[PDB]
Amino acid sequence: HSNILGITSKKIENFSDWYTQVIVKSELIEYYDISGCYILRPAAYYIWECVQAFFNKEIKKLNVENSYFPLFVTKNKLEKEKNHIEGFSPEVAWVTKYGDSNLPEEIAIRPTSETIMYSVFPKWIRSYRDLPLKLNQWNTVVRWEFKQPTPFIRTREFLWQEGHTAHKNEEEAVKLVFDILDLYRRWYEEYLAVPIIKGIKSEGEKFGGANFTSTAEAFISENGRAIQAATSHYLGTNFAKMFKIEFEDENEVKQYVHQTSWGCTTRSIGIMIMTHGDDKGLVLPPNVSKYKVVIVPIFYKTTDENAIHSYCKDIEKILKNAQINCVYDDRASYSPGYKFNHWELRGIPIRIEVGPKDLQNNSCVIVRRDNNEKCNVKKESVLLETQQMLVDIHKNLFLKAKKKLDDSIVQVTSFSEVMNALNKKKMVLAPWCEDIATEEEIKKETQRLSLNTLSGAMKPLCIPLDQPPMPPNMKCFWSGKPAKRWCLFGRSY
Amino acid sequence: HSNILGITSKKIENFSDWYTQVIVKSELIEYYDISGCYILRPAAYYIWECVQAFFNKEIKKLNVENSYFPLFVTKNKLEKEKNHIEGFSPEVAWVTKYGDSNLPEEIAIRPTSETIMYSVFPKWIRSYRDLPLKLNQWNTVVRWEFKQPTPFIRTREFLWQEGHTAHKNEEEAVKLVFDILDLYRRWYEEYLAVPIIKGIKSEGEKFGGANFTSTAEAFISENGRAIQAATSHYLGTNFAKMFKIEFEDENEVKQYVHQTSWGCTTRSIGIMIMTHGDDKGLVLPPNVSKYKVVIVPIFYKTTDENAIHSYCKDIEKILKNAQINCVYDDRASYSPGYKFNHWELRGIPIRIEVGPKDLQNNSCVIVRRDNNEKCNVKKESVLLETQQMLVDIHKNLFLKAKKKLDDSIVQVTSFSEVMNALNKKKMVLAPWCEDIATEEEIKKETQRLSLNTLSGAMKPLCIPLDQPPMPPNMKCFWSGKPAKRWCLFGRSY
Numbered sequence A, B: 001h002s003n004i005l006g007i008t009s010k011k012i013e014n015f016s017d018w019y020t021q022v023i024v025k026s027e028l029i030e031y032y033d034i035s036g037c038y039i040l041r042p043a044a045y046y047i048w049e050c051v052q053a054f055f056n057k058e059i060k061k062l063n064v065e066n067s068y069f070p071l072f073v074t075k076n077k078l079e080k081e082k083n084h085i086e087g088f089s090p091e092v093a094w095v096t097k098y099g100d101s102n103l104p105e106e107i108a109i110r111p112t113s114e115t116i117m118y119s120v121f122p123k124w125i126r127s128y129r130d131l132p133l134k135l136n137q138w139n140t141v142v143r144w145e146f147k148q149p150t151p152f153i154r155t156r157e158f159l160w161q162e163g164h165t166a167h168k169n170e171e172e173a174v175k176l177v178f179d180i181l182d183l184y185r186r187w188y189e190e191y192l193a194v195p196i197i198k199g200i201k202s203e204g205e206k207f208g209g210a211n212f213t214s215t216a217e218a219f220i221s222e223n224g225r226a227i228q229a230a231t232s233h234y235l236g237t238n239f240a241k242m243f244k245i246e247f248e249d250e251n252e253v254k255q256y257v258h259q260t261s262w263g264c265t266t267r268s269i270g271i272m273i274m275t276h277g278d279d280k281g282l283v284l285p286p287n288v289s290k291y292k293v294v295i296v297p298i299f300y301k302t303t304d305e306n307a308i309h310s311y312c313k314d315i316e317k318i319l320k321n322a323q324i325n326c327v328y329d330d331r332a333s334y335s336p337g338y339k340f341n342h343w344e345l346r347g348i349p350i351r352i353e354v355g356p357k358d359l360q361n362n363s364c365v366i367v368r369r370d371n372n373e374k375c376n377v378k379k380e381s382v383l384l385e386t387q388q389m390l391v392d393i394h395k396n397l398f399l400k401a402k403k404k405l406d407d408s409i410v411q412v413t414s415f416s417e418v419m420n421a422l423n424k425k426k427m428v429l430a431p432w433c434e435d436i437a438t439e440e441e442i443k444k445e446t447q448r449l450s451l452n453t454l455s456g457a458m459k460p461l462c463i464p465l466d467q468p469p470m471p472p473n474m475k476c477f478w479s480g481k482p483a484k485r486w487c488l489f490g491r492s493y
Ligand SMILES: Nc1ncnc2cc(-c3cccc(S(=O)(=O)NC(=O)[C@@H]4CCCN4)c3)sc12
Pocket: A111, A112, A113, A114, A143, A145, A152, A153, A154, A155, A156, A158, A161, A162, A163, A207, A230, A231, A233, A261, A262, A263, A264, A265, A266, A267
């Protein structure tokens, strides 16, 4: 990796290389011997801890309790269900030995914990007094996917949380499915300044055993690829029937539980980086940056040295007293411009420059990372203006990313309008009959039309919860049948 | 598992079965298809989260930053070092396939992350400005150990934290080694009410590449087996030489870094259960129990029902207003005695009984879990007395466990005195010359003397930091040579 000090690929001209440079030169990640596995350095894992604390706070209000189930799973429990999502079998890593000894029975590594947890649920669930059962895990899962691996986005091994619940009836379960989905929206908006779109995945793309799969969909405008930001399934009684999870209800009749399972991944970090990063490097919402402010001294005269270091330490004291973490870069070995690029690259939201002009005027210079706008601030008002500026940066990052998302969403009706939008790097909202047979024809056929890596087919992303009005005689864009609902389409990571 | 409602094995008469009953009937764990892997239910994982928050708070003060490295490791990096602790090779689980496809290169699952992290350290460490480097992981590791598996104590898969640091010189590193060790002591004392003994492991039992291995040693008096509660290694330059971790110092001379690595495990939970549990089931320090108080109504007259439920809800309001979580068990389906045993079994520190006698006297009955002592408390003073009683329970649990630890420590000098103590289930402090050749002779030979599961040999546990005075002509108990220091010996889990 060359030119460690700066980003030499513009986000638009070469988005792929720009992303690799940002995550490495900002010290978020490091690559690894094993393809698809990545080292989350402290800067990246700080982001994970912030969203982890937030999500834990909110799911505790729903009485979800954390837990930990084994990393390994027997070939019996896992492969016991070929009616659920058994498309993980080609991706399931198998341990076959310890040392030079071979295992008697092979054991797999969890791609997800549905079979591990739900094999014990019948023991914990005997009557309606035992429901609802609400569990969550903060763990690591493994999926061996031949598809091109992308840091944070499609990885062989990723940290996540997987919640699983079971309920007395349908109404209780589905309300939790969407309550979690809104927590995912806050996960992205409040802490990552990333807008998403709530929807319902088509029958073709839904989770294996799910009744339906709700999703939060993000979009990378620069390369026109949607990403499944987070997921919340209503499994209904499907999984309850497979694993014989039954309960005596209030009227002595035995019933199947209604289950959910929801998960969000370090993929949120990748989406955040792609949404806000620019050619100077990493851009962070203040809520996920360890250092909210960096104080850079700027002078040349040896006489000013003593006065300036004290003035900067005054600012460091004001901020840290107000619980605003910050770094005072007083390294004399590096030029002021080196410090500028170094901390812009690391994504520090705010830079406070202090120079001789500042001492006499009793002020400072404050520079927003998102737009590089500078302003003079009297020393007394530094604390308040810094607080309001961290808020304004977050408000600005979200609204800019929302403008880019909406500019990428185009509403069309005909097949030809759809392809023009598709090859212009847009996410297309079109009327669709939702017949499942049309999903594979649409994907396979659009790929043959998009002449000139990642999959080039146009999948159905999600059917938005927010439905624009459907005209009376509107026809599906592909089949010509009467159209049921508007659906989002596009290429995907 | 029979008699789910109570513990049918006395902790002394059958300690092994008593432990299995406690951890399952108190809903801490559930057994699993794969030997050595255990399900940490919410009650057990709440304990993990409390100590996890505490340890994270304190290591952040030392500027240790959390991170996450890959679960997998190549056969090259792992086996590159046969001079370090390569005794993990027989315990290293190997993935050899994904799906029906075989992997080109086999990949292992981390038993520990020394090789994973230290293969990247040279990239992050170029000069003295880059030191100290302080990293930590909250992750899961795997060791396939044929030894008899015990929940929380010796498991195939366990949660832990592994810190790793690198320093400019020896003084900086070793100070951190012992600073972490004291954090482990607070981990056990402050939050688990478990006393431990700081020591230095013998040269025979030290960690693979360590210069020395400091340890915190706990002791299960009932079955007379010591356990390695926590560990903190000074690796010195040993690992720096293996992985070529060098740095340009302040005087332009390249040097090797001085490293440490420290870890503590869910084994702390197992030690806590064994130390405080009694025949009624689980006994918890208040700091690791979700519910500090359980309010049980006790009446028979239908007339009293309305008044009593309001009186109990008043107490629930007082406690929860003071941030003292509690459960008001108003289930009319279960007898009051059922509730008593149910919540004593789950380890709730305090039970507040409310009956008709309480309403007229405007008081309540408070029952300590640790000693079942009951006392009347006027309703007004419930909040204060409850707070002081949670503190007194913790003070009592620690001091009781410390009395049992010290009664199990016996100081002897001759070989025959040592064996009498050994077969009386004691941890023996004896003078020892520390010659390494004597470690395998002592272990192998004491096993042949202890006539009539787990290893029956007497290992050297640790050489305490607190050294009682050594007489002038004191001779090692085994060799007759002049004795260097007092060392602890005993059987181990
Ligand atoms: N390969 C990857 N690389 C990087 N980041 C990610 C994120 C991924 C993902 C995230 C959420 C949900 C799903 S899911 O639809 O498979 N549902 C499940 O697993 C269910 C629900 C949780 C319990 N099991 C997948 S996969 C992946």
